């Protein structure tokens, strides 16, 4: 006859969701920079990032039902709001801006508006007449010259990101507390769903750079081995196609205009950093991509896409259908000011059976309302000097176009917009599990009386 016995500390886990804390690297700890956007009180990371591997283990992963991406999104939004709150409010900037075109010749396009306005000085009695150089996407004309006002002076309360902070995505390790572990799927071919052969346990993930971008996964992690096409519902076209590259595509984005910063005092203890006169040549921002590398990468992507849809088919690319400026184009921040490159010259090809660089126009937009938080918009201050950044495109957020009665040429257009996909590119191989160390089991043992 058998009897029950209790075992405490059994290798047993169950799917759950819990408040995951963080762990930052102590190398950038000397770069406090007066409370950098993300990492202020992030506990130091593990000096020995112990990552235990398991065998005879299979776990039903799901990158689309994962609750880590939701926690990451909410934490990023809350951290953004709490880093914005103590900065300077720009409520008096909502005034009639007498705007003219920048001092230039013909063949200008706007996109650089010299705007003068009556701004309040320190003393509430006296007033001040100051000028700035806004972008056309930041102002809108109200209807003698042409009078303008900021784009977010009727639907939101504009706030200026106090420039002491930065926007550099710092490696953030979402770590789980005691009684919880994180399961890493360290196999090569993993579409996102189903069982994972190589499931290892760890305290938490690698260094994640929370890059906020659309149509392009900049500074992201590369794919296990080859380009991987990940989508929730292959048949669904709306499902954002999450492509993971194996070779990072270099992209050099440069804001060439030499901007000077004017520190206008809007109030006692209230500052306002505006764009002074541009000293130098008036050019426009651009993002070079080596045409050969982008070509061969698109070739790899279409070769992999020819596996999920038919044996052989025609794959076509095109520039984005429509919507807001943040979706029709590729949005990202390079040196502290977010801007958008329309990337029409990046999705144009068509494949059926079988040295230079491409240049894309980039428009800047300082007044930002990312995450569609209606009623709270941000103002990005200018950056002195030329801006340059060399990023690595490691992913693509595409979307398939609708079919027809008969479809032999499926067309894919860039998209995204929802930043949950930017996190699903990193939190796809991870999942949190709670430990159930209590286990009843039968054996011949039996306690005495």
């Amino acid at each position: 006859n058998l009897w029950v016995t209790v075992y405490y500390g059994v290798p047993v886990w169950k799917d759950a969701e819990t408040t995951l804390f963080c762990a930052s690297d102590a190398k950038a700890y000397e770069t406090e920079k007066h409370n950098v956007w993300a990492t202020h009180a992030c506990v130091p990371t593990d000096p020995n990032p112990q990552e235990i591997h398991l065998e005879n283990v299979t776990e039903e992963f799901n990158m689309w039902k994962n609750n880590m991406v939701e926690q990451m999104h909410t934490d990023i939004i809350s951290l953004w709001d709490q880093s914005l709150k103590p900065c300077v409010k720009l409520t008096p900037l909502c005034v009639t801006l007498q705007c003219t075109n920048v001092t230039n010749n013909i063949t200008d396009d706007g996109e650089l508006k010299n705007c003068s306005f009556n701004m309040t000085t320190e003393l509430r009695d006296k007033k001040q007449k100051v000028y700035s150089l806004f972008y056309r996407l930041d102002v809108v004309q109200i209807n003698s010259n042409k009078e303008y006002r900021l784009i977010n002076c009727n639907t939101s309360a504009i706030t200026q990101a106090c420039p002491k902070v930065s926007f550099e995505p710092i490696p953030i390790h979402y770590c789980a507390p005691a009684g919880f572990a994180i399961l890493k799927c360290k196999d090569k071919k993993f579409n996102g769903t189903g069982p994972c052969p190589s499931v290892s346990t760890v305290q938490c993930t690698h260094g994640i750079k929370p890059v906020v971008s659309t149509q392009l996964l900049l500074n992201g992690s590369l794919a296990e081995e080859e380009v991987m096409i990940r989508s929730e519902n292959i048949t669904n076209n709306a499902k954002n196609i999450l492509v993971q590259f194996n070779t990072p595509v270099q992209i050099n984005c440069t804001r060439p205009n030499n901007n000077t910063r004017k520190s206008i005092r809007i109030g006692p203890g209230q500052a306002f950093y505006a764009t002074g006169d541009i000293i130098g040549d008036i050019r426009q921002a651009h993002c070079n991509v080596s045409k050969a590398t982008w070509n061969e990468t698109l070739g790899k992507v279409v070769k992999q896409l020819r596996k999920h849809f038919g044996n052989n088919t025609i794959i076509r690319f095109a520039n984005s259908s429509g919507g807001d400026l943040e979706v029709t184009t590729h949005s990202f921040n390079c040196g502290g000011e977010f801007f958008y490159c329309n990337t029409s010259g990046l999705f144009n090809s068509t494949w059926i059976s079988n040295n230079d660089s491409i240049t894309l126009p980039c428009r800047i937009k300082q007044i930002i309302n990312m995450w569609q938080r209606i009623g709270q918009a941000m103002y990005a201050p200018p950056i002195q000097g030329v801006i340059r950044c060399v990023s690595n495109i490691t992913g693509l957020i595409l979307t398939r176009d609708g079919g027809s009665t008969n479809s032999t040429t499926e067309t894919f257009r860039p998209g995204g917009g929802d930043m949950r996909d930017n996190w699903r590119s990193e939190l796809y191989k991870y999942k949190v599990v709670k430990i159930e160390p209590l286990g009843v089991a039968p054996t011949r043992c039996k306690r005495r009386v």
Partner: antibody
Amino acid sequence: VQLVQSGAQVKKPGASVTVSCTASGYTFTGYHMHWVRQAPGQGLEWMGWINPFRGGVKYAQKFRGRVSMTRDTSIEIFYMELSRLRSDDTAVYYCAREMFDSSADWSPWRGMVAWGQGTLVTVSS
Amino acid sequence: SALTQPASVSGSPGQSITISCTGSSRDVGGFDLVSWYQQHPGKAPKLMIYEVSKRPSGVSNRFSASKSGNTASLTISGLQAEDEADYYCYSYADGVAFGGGTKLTVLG
């Protein structure tokens, strides 16, 4: 919930018609919006769908290039612009609210629970 | 259209009728979301059968929906004079595809 549309329009062949559908009584940034076209006396035709969150639009193959769908989340109004109008475009247009949210529990297409009053555009030479 | 419906069906009040929505294997059979809308003459349609068989609110149990292979069917039990309107089929044909529409006539 209510979807109020504009009035009937009279456009010459080759013009551009801009119709507006205003929504009331729900969260504007959480429900897709289909644009349905129907010629008087014929079947039902689809044109595209709008996602108000960032306004991600996807048009039908028959009108890709002609139609442009946008939205103003401040006033909560969907706008549909149609260029290169032909005599076939004389029809009634409707704005259809999706039954569920597109972000949640939405892999496949389903639901047009709420519709608009329909705007009749008359295109004749 | 991508679907083929009867041009017009008829029935006696109180009886049951079946409207067939014939589609390919990639639109009606390949998925499970054939829906049925009720369009009155001159008015906006109304969703009366969402999903593939389930019904949204405001619609009584007089309507039902089934699917056999690639052929969907809408069954109406206890016909009434109010049902003398059009009823459109809808399917996800790698997109949005609707049935050709069928005019319903009862006691007339």
